[PDB]
Structures are given as structure tokens and as C-alpha cells.
RNA sequence: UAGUCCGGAUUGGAGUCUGCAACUCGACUCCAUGAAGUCGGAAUCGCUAGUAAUCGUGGAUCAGAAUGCCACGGUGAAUAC
RNA sequence: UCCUCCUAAAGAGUAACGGAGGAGCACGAAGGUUGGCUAAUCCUGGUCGGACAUCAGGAGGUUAGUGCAAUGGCAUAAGCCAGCUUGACUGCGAGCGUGACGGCGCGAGCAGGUGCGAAAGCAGGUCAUAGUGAUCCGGUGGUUCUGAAUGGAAGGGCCAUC
RNA sequence: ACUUACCAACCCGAUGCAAACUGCGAAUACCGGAGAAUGUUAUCACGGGAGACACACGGCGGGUGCUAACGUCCGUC
RNA sequence: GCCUGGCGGCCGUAGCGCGGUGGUCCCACCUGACCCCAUGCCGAACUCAGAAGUGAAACGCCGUAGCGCCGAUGGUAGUGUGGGGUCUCCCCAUGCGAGAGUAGGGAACUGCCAGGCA
RNA sequence: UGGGGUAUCGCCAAGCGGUAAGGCACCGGAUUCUGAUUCCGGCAUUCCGAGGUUCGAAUCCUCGUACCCCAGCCA
């Protein structure tokens, strides 16, 4: 709720100032933050996907939803309805708390941190990034890791254009190399 | 390599428009719901449409998809 | 949220070497020691020493 | 679309009740009102209607759009419907879950004598 | 020789060749070789006639073959009885009716189009005529 | 084909049985179905996946 | 008792000396890196006593360049029916 | 032998050693009901991650799906997911369709008992059309219906069934 | 990373073909209802007796054949 | 009379797209969620308690024909009956008569009930 | 022309739809004055070509190619 209050005064005010909106509700707001961990090496092992699920359970504060295969493809030796990833849809209060931990303490603990790419918008403002280690979150115990498992974050927001998402995210200072 | 066909199933419209029916009479023995059930018409398990009340057969075209209903006018 | 299927997500206090005492909710279940925060991380000095190579 | 999803949830029971030919009590829940109207078996003409936008109902309520308001509306539709000779209807929940204040409205219509 | 790359069924019924044609105006080019007789045209006759045209008006010009075979004709071998299945697909014909512009040509004078269309109409089995591109 | 024939016998004292077919290989468990018993005239539990 | 405080190859940086001149193409030093290798398949070699084994030192050639060659000593076996 | 399309001439039917394909099952959930949901494919962004495994957004519109061929159907979904379940009931059945017949099919409703649903209601298997075999002879369970003097029994019948 | 007489998806414009293609769609035929005239009930049901179940050509619609056959297989007259 | 909401008739002359406008009420987004209830994670949806804020999105209304859609008249194709030929195809008398295309029409029309404004 | 069979390392020959096994050869080392024999190590065919079913093809289906076997008759 720290960055939610910071949103409600200074990001709403700041973006009403920058872009010449009329409505106070036309301003972009971040809808949700989805944390995917598409493990894929669970074609042979179930405890590996269980450990992946424990890691997203630690990084967010929620149980993950173990996702199944939509189509069967033979390129990767999977089958229809076989469990192959896990995700957490963070929204509401926990979106802002995770977003605070993310841009505050998790992003600086990235190895060789140069900055987050500004051209990682999908055309509709929705950011998506990938971390390569789960170690960069302070909850994951470094002595209890077995496999290095990155994950991909996706900030989904209500902006129409992607420069409008540059503005929204950049008003949280959200590093942007 | 050929030379086979099934026995002809005798589908189609058994009672036409304006034709007086008893209750229970089969109107259209058919295969999907080419014709849908309307007022006082039932649809059997093999999509056979049968007269559920007495009257006269009424073929109509209803609804947003231009479906072909079959009503029965009470008569 | 549902009942107890989720991990215990209790408010803790993180503190780094920058003097940034910051209380947050995290499901570690333990108070935290850090080094780098968003305040006083070598991001801009890092970009400067990155560009500053040639000659 | 939320409204269109609701209408396609409604449609099966709507067409089934038009097929049986029963007078239906159509409910309609909005975030600050509930609407209830008794509709003839031809589907075109209404008979009885009460809702929280009527000041006869709205003045005696704290807030239109909660379970007390909906119970008031169900009582009103049952009273007016019994005054106009209608006894036995079929409840068209109109795409909402029979849970919250549509359950309060329909229970209130069953207490006050309307047969379904 | 022209033949569809990939059919849907290998053997077609005979059927009949009645009525008039659909391709009737000189559409693409400027001069046209239009059918008058009914008949049908194998792929060898279309190829023969096209070589007569392409030779005749040399590698200048531009020629459109407006008909395409797409109809398989089956024959039974020699000393085979009747019955015992349908024959085998030997060639492919196009069915022609009176009015089909069989070929078009553009980028030549009219007198060479007369000449190539004479040269190539003597490789076809149907009575044929010369047409021009009429404007509406 | 592979799918065998079994008798669902009645749990009441009657000898009345329904009859049906079971895949014996994939479902080796017995089959209990509360069916209708017309001698008792009542819905009784039926057993005996043969 | 660990590929480890074994092993030092390889490589980056910084140097000293000789020599007109160390890029091809020296030697040595300092910091960093830290491979392969855990006793070697078929096969094969040397040694009978101050010997083998092992440890250092010197010299010739040479401005500078030896793990080679030629010498010198220290410790010092086993076994031969 | 059976199913689907065409031939087949816009009702039905219609032949050939005519053109093309399939069946001789599966399922105790893949059936019943209630509540909900909506595909293929492509584009963009994104850790390993790749033309194609997961995530997010957009275009798109059912080009998808339907346990298995093809045709006709399907959004109110007949498609997809979950809760509870056994109506994959028993006796009948107005009326029809379809066959030379044997036979086959559709069926509102009535009675008894049941499931789901708050209720209206829906449920006598599955989206439909294939998944099959008359009679005799005989096997197993039930029912005194018969039971060659009489009481039983044997055998026979009837119902279920192999 | 730099050039290119070669091919080409999708999309758009224009042109054809289809028994097993259809966002269209006749004539006819068929089913049902009413009405007039005409017809030796021509109609239906039930009962006695059959015969026949090798068809042929000709028109029209087709399959097969080579739009061959006084060919073959259907539909209808 | 104008506007809005519900349930229908009708099923593209009714749908799309582009542009403008609406919020007093209504509607929608919204605010919050410990409770009723819910998520194979998540109050996103469902649900509940509300009403601060905005009509941005949505939805409605008003324009606009770029498209979809409707669509004559005439001619053409086909075809029933009778006749004819040069007869694998056509012609004549006669009855029916398209599909496509053209001119054009065209951004709906309407019933019941309820509420707000005049 | 029909029916059947085969095509897999340089050669002969095994392969079960989720991996390519054997022998001879070849390559390197060793033994030997040198070669043969011998001994120690290796490698190795993405499976005749094209299309399709499948998540996946050497494997299953269809077509083409090349080579074998059987039949191609009564008059």
C-alpha cells in the first residue's frame, strides 16, 4: 500500500500533468502482475515442479496455479493436459506489496544489473521481464536451492499505448536502462 | 476396392404444412436439427420431430439465426 | 484469498547498509539484512563507468 | 462483455419458460437497485412490476441495493400479484446466481404467498 | 502440359457439356481466340496451340491461356472386357462451350494476332474465331 | 470385444439382477449401483461386478 | 583425504635484465587465473653396491638464453634359488 | 452383413465387378442434473525456451471441438470445466415412421420408486446415423403355473439370462 | 553484415472449373386442404383363383463404355 | 413530448467501421471486503456492504454510406406440355422463369411496463 | 501386368513407433628386423526418395525408384 498511496497522489497527479487527459480515470493504472515459471523439465519429474511451485509460493505470497499443456506438441515431448508450468496472478493489495519489493529490493539484487530494457512493451503498455535467478528474491534461501530457476514477470496495465506505460512505470522510477 | 453403401434411411418431411396430425405423429424424421422444435412439437432422441398436441403443421422461420421451426396450431 | 493453503505472509522489517530501514510484507517470516537498496545502488554510476571505456 | 455474458446465461431458462408457457417473475439486479416484474406467457406484456426505483418502496429503505431492499421488492411483487389474481409463477433469475439478493427477493416472494 | 497439381478425387463422372460459356469478353489482353464449337480440349492441344502462338509472335507479346483442363478422362486398356471397375486416368481435358475465349494476346499488332491465332487454331478440334477487346 | 458381461445382483433377498458390461482390466474394483428392485419395489444397492 | 593448503599448465596485467633490437621469437620476477592429472591398455626399459632410487651443486657453448650434455658430492636400498 | 457421401433426375426409394470411406466398439464416466465457461491460428512482449511446451496483451471469428468414418447438426451449445449422483430405472403406452414378413425405430403421457435443482423443470443412457446374429438345442437364478393313482420330486412352462 | 536476371506465402483486384463445393435457386414432381364438371367406383378393405419375378426398343435424365455398339446398368414415359 | 432501464416482436433497409455527445435520475466503471458466497492462484470473475470519483472504457443516442445488407425493370440461363432439326446439341409454339449484374434503397421499425425531466 | 519380398555403416546382415546391436573391414597404438597373425583402443550409418497420420517415424500408411521370387492359364 506504500506504492498504491504513492500512485494515488503523485502518479495520478503526475500523469494528469504530463498527458493532457480530461478524465481523472483516463489515467493508466496497473491492473495485475502475473508471475509465471514455465518449468518444462517436469516432463520426467514431479518433485521438480513441486519445488518450482514452492518457489513461486515464496516469491509471491500465494499458492501458484500449476498450468497444463494446451496443445500437444512433439517438439518438446509433451502431451495434452500435461502439467508444465506454474503461475501466480497477483492483484490488489499484494500486487502493490510485491511491486514494492520488486522495484525496491529484488531488482537491485540482480547480478550485473545494467537496467531493465525499455523496449519490452507488447504495444499495449503491458511490461514483461524475466529474471534468471530465484536467488535475487530475499525469501529464497540460498542454502536450500537445488536448481536455478528464473521466472518471468508481467505487469498488465490499463494503458492503451506503450509510451503511456513508459510513463506509468517510470513514475515509480523503475530503472529503465 | 468399392462397392458398398448403407441401406437408405427414409428421412425427410413426413407431414407437410397445413397437414392435420394426431398427437404423437412424426413430422420430420431427420438427422441433425435441420428443422427445430416449435410450439407443441417435441424433438426425439434422434432429432425426430413429433407432434406433441393435435392440430396443423406450421413451418416457420424464427429467431436471429433464421432457423426453421415447426409449430403445431391447435385444431 | 482462501484459507491456509497460502504461505504465512507477515509484515517484517528490512534494513540495508544504506541506512534504509524499510518495513514490508514478505513471507520470509524473519527480519532482513541487505546491502543494496533502490536508494544508493550503483545504477547511474554503473552506466557511467560502462560508457566511459574508450581512448 | 459482462452484460452479454449474463444474457447468454439467461437464455436457456428464458426459452424453456417460453416453451412451457408459464408466467415468469423476471428479476434484475444492479449495483444499487433490484427490479422485479411479472410477465405474461406471451412474453410481451407485463402484469405487475415493483422495484427500488419506485419511491413507494425506496422511502422506507435505508439503501436500495442490498438484501433488505430486495426482500422489500419481493414482498411488493407478491402483494401486487396476489391483488391482480396471479398465483403461480415461475422464477426467472435472468442470469444471476440464485444466491444473494435475488434469493432474498424470491424467498420474500414465497413467504408472501406467490407460488413457486 | 497442364494438369491440376493436386485433385480431391481421381475420377470424375462424364457429365454433359451444355449451354453457353462464361468467359466471353477479352479480359486480360487485347486480342482473343474465342471458341465457337462445343467440343473439349486436352492438355496436349492447349500446349500445341500455345507453342504455335509463342513461336509465331516471337518472345515479344504476352499470352494468357484462359482455359485450364481440370477434368480427368479415363480409358480402359486394349483387350479388357467391360466392367470390373472404372478405367484409368489417361489425360485431362477442359470442357469448352460456344463463347469461351480460349486464349488472349497483348503487345503485338493485330495482324500478328491474326497470324498466331490462325496458326494455333489449326491445332484445336473446335471451330474458333478471333475477337478483340470491346469496351463495355 | 474385451469388455466383459457382469450381473448386478440385488442386495435385498430377491434374486433379481440387472446385467451389464464392465472393462475388467482397467476397472478391477466392484461396481455398486443403487438401482430399482421390482420385487421389493424399492431402490436397493446392487453389487457384483463379475 | 578433499581434485583439496596436491598439481602447476594456460591466460590477463604489471615489470627487470641482456642486447642496435625480445612482434614473429628470450630469460627471469610480482599480482591474478588455476587446465589435464587420483599411478597409467597392449606392450616396454634401466639397474648387482655407494649401485638403483632420491636430493641438491658446478661447468662447456654463451651478450642473453638448459627440463639437454658433461661433471660433483648428500642420503642410500631391495634382490640374485 | 452393417454405417456415411455421391450416382439419385430439389418428397421417399432407385442399379452396375460405378466413384470414395468406415464398423464388428468404447464409456460407471465419456451417462443424469445443476452451476459456470468458450475455440483454431497468427502477431507483439517475455528466464532457461527453440519453428512450435508456460505467461501476458492484441487480431480473429468457430477456419475449433464433437471417444472412433462421413454427412447432417451444435453457442440456449450437442463443445469445455466443476458439485452431487445412478433415470445406463421397473410395468405400460395415445399416436406415428419403416419394412413382403421376421423385424426395426420415434414417442408425449399413466403408475411405482429415484437423482439433480431454490424452483419452473430435466433424466427410461451417450449430438444423431454403424458396433451385429432368427430358431432349435441346452446352461444358470427366480416363480408350486403344471407335475399322467395320490403327496412330493424329475421334467416342462413363465420371467430374467448365458 | 553487403548485393541479386530466381521462386513465392498471406492480402487485394480481375478470370474460369466441380458428382462427392453452396452465402443463391427454378420448372416439374410430391404431400395436404377447398371447389366445379366429367368418369359404368375408376378408390379402399376383406375373401376365392392366378399368372409372373429372361424383358425389348424408342424419347427424356444419368452411371459405365470411347457421350462406341441392335452394348450394359438405373429413373420416368 | 425528451431521456434511461427491463421484457418482447423482428432478425443485417436491423450489422460493421469512422466522427460527435450523455450522466439530475438511470446505467456502467467505481469504493471496500471481516462477514453470505467465490477463485483448480488471485474479491479478475461470482458475491456482499456501499457511493467518494469519472463518464475514460462500456453502453445508449445523434451524424457519416467506406463496406456488409436489401433490390427492381429489362434481357439471359433453365424448364413442364406439344412439335421440329443438321439431333453427344439445339430450335419452334406455349406456360412458368431464375442466379449474377444494373438503376436505386439503405445507417431500422415497433409493443408492454417502470423511473427521471419539462 | 498382378501378388509377395528387400533397400539400415565401405561389405554381409539385426532392429519392438520414444535408444540404432553383430561380424569383416578402416583408423590409432603395441608385438615384430619388416609384413602377415596376434593384442589394446576407437569410429561408424539421423536408416532408398517424396508426401501424409502422430506429441514423436528406421519403425505406421500411400506413391515413385532399384533388385529378387511366384504367376501370367484352357482354349
Q: For each of the domains in chain D, give its residue range(s) and CATH number, in order of start.
A: 1-116 (3.30.420.100)
Write the CATH number for E62. 3.90.1170.10
C-alpha cell at B73: 396450431
Task: Show the CA angle centred on residue B50, arms to residues B46 and B56, nearest 5°.
Answer: 155
The β-bridge partners of C8 are none
Q: Find the Cα–Cα–Cα–Cα dihedral A165, C46, C37, A169, rounded to 10°.
A: 0
Q: What is the CA radius of gyration of chain E?
A: 17
Distance CA C31, CA E66 (A): 83
Q: Are B42 and B50 in contact (CB under 8 A)?
A: yes
Against chain A, the chains showing at least 3 CB pairs within 8 Å are C
Q: Are A83 and A43 in contact (CB under 8 A)?
A: no
Q: Tell me the nearest-neighbour CA distance from A160 into chain C, angstroms.
A: 28
CA distances A151 to A37, A59, A82, A136, Å, are 5, 10, 20, 11
User: b/e string for A120-150 if b means 16 or more Cβ within 10 A?
Assistant: ebeeebbbeeebebbbbbbbbeeeeeeeebe
- Counting beta carbons within 10 angstroms of the beta carbon of residue D24, is it exposed (0 to 12), middle (13 to 18) or buried (19 or more)? buried
CA distances D39 to B16, B17, D36, D51, Å, are 34, 32, 10, 14
Is C38 within 8 Å of A173 when comparing Cβ atoms? yes
Is A177 within 8 Å of C47 when comparing Cβ atoms? yes
Q: Is A44 within the bounds of a domain?
A: yes
Sheet holding B12-13, edge to edge: B12-13, B26-29, B49-51, B41-43
Give how far the C-alpha of residue B35 lies from the chain's centroid of Cα atoms, to the nearest Å: 6
Would the Cβ of A155 be found within 7 angstroms of any atom in strand H? no
Write the CATH number for A133. 3.30.1440.10
Domain coordinates in residue numbering, chain B:
11-75
Q: Are A137 and A35 in contact (CB under 8 A)?
A: no
Number of domains in chain E: 1
Residue A139 has its nearest CB partner, among C28, C38, C41, at C28
- Which residues of chain F between 1 and 50 are close to nucleic strand H, CB under 7 A? 1-3, 5, 14-15, 17-23, 26-27, 31, 33-36, 38, 41-43
Q: Residue D70: name the closest of D33, D26, D114, D98 by CA.
A: D33
Would you tell me how many other CB atoms lie within 10 Å of the CB of residue C19?
Answer: 9
C-alpha cell at D48: 405487475
Question: What's the CA C36/C1' H40 distance, rounded, in angstroms?
Answer: 48
Q: Which domain holds residue E94?
A: 21-136
Tell me the domains of chain F and their CATH numbers.
1-50 (2.20.28.120)
C-alpha cell at F7: 450381473
Exp. method = cryo-EM
Q: Which residue has the cell 487527459?
A: A21
Number of domains in chain A: 1
Name the 3-class secondary structure at A143.
Answer: helix
Distance CA E69, CA E91 (A): 9
The β-bridge partners of B71 are B58
Distance CA D87, CA B73 (A): 28
Q: Is A58 on the interface with C (CB under 8 A)?
A: yes
- A9 DSSP 8-state letter: I
Question: What's the CA D42/C1' J81 distance, rounded, in angstroms?
Answer: 50
How many residues does the structure list for chain B?
75
Q: Is A177 within the bounds of a domain?
A: no
Q: Is A53 within the bounds of a domain?
A: yes
Q: Are E86 and E130 in contact (CB under 8 A)?
A: no
Q: H or E segment at D45?
A: none
Q: Is E131 within the bounds of a domain?
A: yes
Distance CA B48, CA B31 (A): 8
Q: Are D94 and D28 in contact (CB under 8 A)?
A: yes
Would the Cβ of C2 be found within 7 angstroms of any atom in strand J? yes
Against chain E, the chains showing at least 3 CB pairs within 8 Å are none
Q: Which of D15-19's residues contact partners 24+ apart within 8 Å by CB, and which partners?
A: D17/D90, D17/D92, D18/D43, D19/B39
CA distances D71 to C16, D26, D46, Å, are 57, 15, 21
Kind of pairing between the strands at B67-73 and B36-37: parallel
DSSP string, A90-135: E-THHHHHHHHHIIIIISTTSTT-----SS-B-SSS-EEEEES-ST
Distance CA D90, CA D110 (A): 11
Q: Is C49 on the interface with A (CB under 8 A)?
A: no
Q: Are C38 and A103 in contact (CB under 8 A)?
A: yes
Q: Are F30 and F47 in contact (CB under 8 A)?
A: yes
Q: Which domain holds residue A161?
A: 3-172
Amino acid at each position: 500500500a506504500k506504492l498504491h498511496d504513492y500512485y494515488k497522489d503523485e502518479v495520478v497527479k503526475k500523469l494528469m500533468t504530463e498527458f493532457n487527459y480530461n478524465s481523472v480515470m483516463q489515467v493508466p493504472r496497473v491492473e495485475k502482475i502475473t508471475l509465471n515459471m514455465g518449468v518444462g523439465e517436469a516432463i520426467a519429474d514431479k518433485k521438480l515442479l513441486d519445488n518450482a511451485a514452492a518457489d513461486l509460493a515464496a516469491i509471491s505470497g500465494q499458492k501458484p496455479l500449476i498450468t497444463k499443456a494446451r496443445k500437444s506438441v512433439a517438439g518438446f515431448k509433451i502431451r495434452q493436459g500435461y502439467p508444465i508450468g506454474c503461475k501466480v496472478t497477483l492483484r490488489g493489495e499484494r500486487m502493490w506489496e510485491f511491486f514494492e519489493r520488486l522495484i525496491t529490493i529484488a531488482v537491485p539484487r540482480i547480478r550485473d544489473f545494467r537496467g531493465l530494457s525499455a523496449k519490452s512493451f507488447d504495444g499495449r503498455g503491458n511490461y514483461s521481464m524475466g529474471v534468471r535467478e530465484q536467488i535475487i528474491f530475499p525469501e529464497i534461501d540460498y542454502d536450500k536451492v537445488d536448481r536455478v530457476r528464473g521466472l518471468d514477470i508481467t505487469i498488465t496495465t490499463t494503458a492503451k499505448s506503450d509510451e503511456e506505460g513508459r510513463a506509468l512505470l517510470a513514475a515509480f522510477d523503475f530503472p529503465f536502462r | 476396392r468399392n462397392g458398398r453403401d448403407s441401406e437408405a434411411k427414409r428421412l425427410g418431411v413426413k407431414r407437410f404444412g397445413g397437414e392435420s396430425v394426431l398427437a404423437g405423429s412424426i413430422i420430420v424424421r431427420q438427422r441433425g436439427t435441420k428443422f427445430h422444435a416449435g410450439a407443441n412439437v417435441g424433438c426425439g432422441r434422434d432429432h425426430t420431430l413429433f407432434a406433441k398436441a393435435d392440430g396443423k403443421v406450421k413451418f416457420e422461420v424464427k429467431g436471429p439465426k433464421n432457423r426453421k421451426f415447426i409449430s403445431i396450431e391447435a385444431e | 484469498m482462501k484459507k491456509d493453503i497460502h504461505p504465512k505472509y507477515e509484515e517484517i522489517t528490512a534494513s540495508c547498509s544504506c541506512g534504509n530501514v524499510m518495513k514490508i510484507r514478505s513471507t520470509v517470516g524473519h527480519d532482513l539484512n541487505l546491502d543494496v537498496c533502490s536508494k544508493c545502488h550503483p545504477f547511474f554510476t554503473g552506466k557511467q563507468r560502462d560508457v566511459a571505456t574508450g581512448g | 462483455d459482462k452484460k452479454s455474458a449474463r444474457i447468454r446465461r439467461a437464455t436457456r431458462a428464458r426459452r424453456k419458460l417460453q416453451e412451457l408457457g408459464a408466467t415468469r417473475l423476471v428479476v434484475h439486479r444492479t449495483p444499487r437497485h433490484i427490479y422485479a416484474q411479472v410477465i405474461a406467457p406471451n412474453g410481451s406484456e407485463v402484469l405487475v412490476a415493483a422495484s427500488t426505483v419506485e419511491k413507494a418502496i425506496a422511502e422506507q429503505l435505508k439503501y436500495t441495493g442490498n438484501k433488505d431492499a430486495a426482500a422489500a421488492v419481493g414482498k411488493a411483487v407478491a402483494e401486487r400479484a396476489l391483488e391482480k389474481g396471479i398465483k403461480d409463477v415461475s422464477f426467472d433469475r435472468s442470469g444471476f446466481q440464485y444466491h444473494g439478493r435475488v434469493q432474498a427477493l424470491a424467498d420474500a416472494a414465497r413467504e408472501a404467498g406467490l407460488q413457486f | 502440359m497442364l494438369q491440376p497439381k493436386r485433385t480431391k478425387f481421381r475420377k470424375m463422372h462424364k457429365g454433359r457439356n451444355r449451354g453457353l460459356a462464361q468467359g466471353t469478353d477479352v479480359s486480360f489482353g487485347s486480342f482473343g481466340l474465342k471458341a465457337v464449337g462445343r467440343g473439349r480440349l486436352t492438355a496436349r492441344q492447349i500446349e500445341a496451340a500455345r507453342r504455335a502462338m509463342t513461336r509465331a509472335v516471337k518472345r515479344q507479346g504476352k499470352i494468357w491461356i484462359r482455359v485450364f483442363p481440370d477434368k480427368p478422362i479415363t480409358e480402359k486398356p486394349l483387350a479388357v472386357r467391360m466392367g470390373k471397375g472404372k478405367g484409368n486416368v489417361e489425360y485431362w481435358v477442359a470442357l469448352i462451350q460456344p463463347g469461351k475465349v480460349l486464349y488472349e494476346m497483348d503487345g503485338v499488332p493485330e495482324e500478328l494476332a491474326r497470324e498466331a491465332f490462325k496458326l494455333a487454331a489449326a491445332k484445336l478440334p473446335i471451330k474458333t474465331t478471333f475477337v478483340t477487346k470491346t469496351v463495355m | 470385444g474385451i469388455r466383459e458381461k457382469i450381473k448386478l445382483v440385488s442386495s435385498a433377498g430377491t434374486g433379481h439382477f440387472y446385467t451389464t458390461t464392465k472393462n475388467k482390466r482397467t476397472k478391477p474394483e466392484k461396481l455398486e449401483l443403487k438401482k430399482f428392485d421390482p420385487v421389493v419395489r424399492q431402490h436397493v444397492i446392487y453389487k457384483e461386478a463379475k
